[PDB]
Design a protein around this ligand. Structure first.
Ligand SMILES: [Ca+2]
Ligand SMILES: [Ca+2]
Ligand SMILES: [Ca+2]
Ligand SMILES: [Ca+2]
Length: 445
């Protein structure tokens, strides 16, 4: 219920990554690596939240807005538990993290983040040195800067053009909805006077026979905007359409679909620049290395034609999909001071206990480990199935607490040997509670 930004501290780095290694920083190709270790005050409790905010020059997804899912819940790599659940509000350049009861059940809470974030060209219309990018974790801001250098538009004689994909959502291997993509074309950014100007956009290139792009009247939608004289177009293709005039309806009879995945827009005589947004559906593919290529060409009287285009590769994540799915079990050996067989707030883990997992039906040992400082353990890479977890090497003088108390199998003790079931998720309920009886030395009289 409370903002605890003031109760977290962090050690953070933000570094631009020249992904293509071409010694130029460009929002469409490059990104930012955010890394942080966050410490949370013990006063923090379940339902409290902290924020991560980021400057106007930063966004948390690139071409695929669905990629926002890559920045999610913060989890403990040592015991599998979720520490805080994440919720995005990109309109407010905000990520909010709400703590789970993890922070009630453990002290000395720490979290790590390792994110790839992106440059937002919205406020970077032109090439500019020392553009600042920053991120604010709780109340602590981290900054870095880069020199942004965009490519020139392409021109031949008085013809000029530029283009970029602005959005791509590929669902390769899916036949019913293969996904969609958008390309924006700048026509006549030089603002020359042209006559009989025509734009041709085509998902065709002789060097890329295997091409998932697709342009036809069935699947393609086109919007056209006119920019006023001297208007400075955004070089990152991040277009503020509210500032332009939507003239799509004046082109209704000027748009012609043609052969081999082409569409033609007849501009006639122009002297303004125009922004053409082409939205279309991917073709279905079984390729595993899908390639998209889409070219744009402007012709006009008395000038040589000029062509540009964009290509992108995709990674067919379905085909193969890393040998099915595996999950982890395990998670907690605690000192059950209560002796109630129930994990209570205030009780803590026991280090150095050996844990072994065997496949109940199959055969035997599928994993083994030892509890850490916090009593936590994990056994990774388990398929669905029934497992016998066995605890051993209890510390001298310790006794096993009553098994399966209460009606909550997540908060009880399993006993040194039990069977748990993995099915589509981690099973972290294989826990053991132990206690130390007072020393009972020698005889009594
Ligand atoms: Ca680069
Ligand atoms: Ca207890
Ligand atoms: Ca249990
Ligand atoms: Ca557990």
């Amino acid at each position: 219920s409370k903002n605890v930004n003031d109760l977290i501290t962090s050690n953070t780095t933000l570094t631009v990554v020249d992904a293509i290694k071409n010694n130029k920083i460009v929002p469409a190709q490059d990104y930012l690596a955010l890394k942080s270790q966050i410490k949370v005050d013990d006063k923090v409790k379940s339902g409290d939240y902290f924020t991560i905010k980021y400057s106007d020059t930063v966004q948390v997804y690139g071409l695929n807005p669905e990629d926002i899912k890559n920045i999610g819940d913060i989890k403990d790599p040592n015991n599998g538990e979720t520490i805080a659940t994440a919720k995005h509000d990109t309109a407010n350049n905000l990520i909010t993290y709400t703590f789970t009861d993890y922070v009630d059940r453990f002290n000395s809470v720490q979290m790590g983040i390792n994110y790839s974030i992106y440059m937002d060209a919205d406020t970077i219309p032109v090439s500019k040195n020392d553009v600042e990018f920053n991120v604010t974790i709780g109340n602590d801001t981290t900054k870095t800067t880069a020199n942004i250098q965009y490519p020139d538009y392409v021109s031949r004689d008085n013809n000029s053009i530029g283009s970029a994909f602005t959005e791509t959502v590929s669902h390769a291997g899916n036949a019913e909805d293969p996904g969609y993509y958008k390309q924006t074309v700048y026509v006549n950014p030089s603002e020359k006077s042209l006559t009989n100007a025509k734009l041709k956009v085509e998902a065709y290139h002789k060097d890329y026979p295997d091409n998932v792009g697709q342009i036809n009247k069935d699947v393609t939608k086109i919007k056209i905007y006119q920019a006023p004289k001297d208007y400075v177009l955004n070089k990152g293709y991040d277009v503020n359409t509210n500032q332009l005039i939507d003239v799509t309806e004046q082109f209704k009879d000027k748009i012609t679909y043609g052969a081999n995945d082409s569409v033609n827009v007849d501009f006639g005589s122009i002297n303004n620049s125009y922004v053409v947004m082409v939205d279309t559906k991917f073709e279905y593919t079984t390729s595993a290395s899908p390639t998209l290529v889409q070219m744009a060409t402007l012709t006009s009287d008395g000038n040589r034609s000029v062509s540009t285009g964009n290509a992108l590769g995709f990674t067919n994540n379905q085909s193969g999909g890393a040998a099915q799915e595996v999950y982890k079990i395990g998670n907690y050996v605690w000192e059950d001071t209560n002796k109630n067989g129930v994990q209570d707030l205030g009780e803590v883990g026991v280090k150095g206990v050996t844990v072994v997992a065997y496949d109940n039906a199959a055969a035997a040992e599928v994993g083994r480990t030892i509890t850490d400082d916090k009593g936590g353990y994990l056994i990774p890479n388990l398929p669905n199935g029934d497992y016998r977890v066995e605890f051993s090497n209890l510390p001298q003088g310790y006794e096993v607490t009553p098994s399966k108390q209460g009606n909550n199998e997540e908060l009880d003790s399993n006993g040194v040997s039990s069977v748990i079931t993995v099915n589509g998720k981690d099973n972290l309920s294989a826990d053991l509670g132990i206690y130390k009886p007072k020393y009972n030395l020698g005889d009594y009289a």
